[PDB]
Amino acid sequence: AMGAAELRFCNQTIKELMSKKHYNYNFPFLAPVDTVALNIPNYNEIVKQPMDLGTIQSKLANNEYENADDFEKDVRLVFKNCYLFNPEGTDVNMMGHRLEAVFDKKWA
């Protein structure tokens, strides 16, 4: 697993993305996609791997990431999956870009 200092930073980062400070645009990403509610039955077979912020937090807590780059890859996957299913200009697409910008600022 990643070193202690990077683990702390990644924990802070995922908590930031999930924070109530961003409640108006992180809600689509906190938990697994509701494929029934969204009428996207083949979602899991289309995306490379499904992912959500809560699962990233749980994977981090179980020491699943070898380094912080691997943590970043899962964050990017959340947003890649967003844009694959939500066209540019739509509400959820824009929320994804806004939350990804929060990540980019923290990660820079």
Curated annotation (Swiss-Prot):
Subcellular location: Nucleus
Transmembrane segments: none
Domain of life of the source: Eukaryota
Induction conditions: Expression is regulated by FKH2 and repressed upon adherence to polystyrene and interaction with macrophages.
Domain Bromo: 4-108
Function of the molecule: Transcription factor involved in the expression of a broad class of genes including snRNAs. Required for sporulation and DNA-damage repair. Prevents the spreading of SIR silencing at telomeres and protects histone H4, but not H3, from deacetylation.
Family indicated by similarity: Belongs to the BET family.
Designated name of the protein: Bromodomain-containing factor 1
Organism: Candida albicans (strain SC5314 / ATCC MYA-2876)
Portion held of the full protein: 386 to 490 of 732
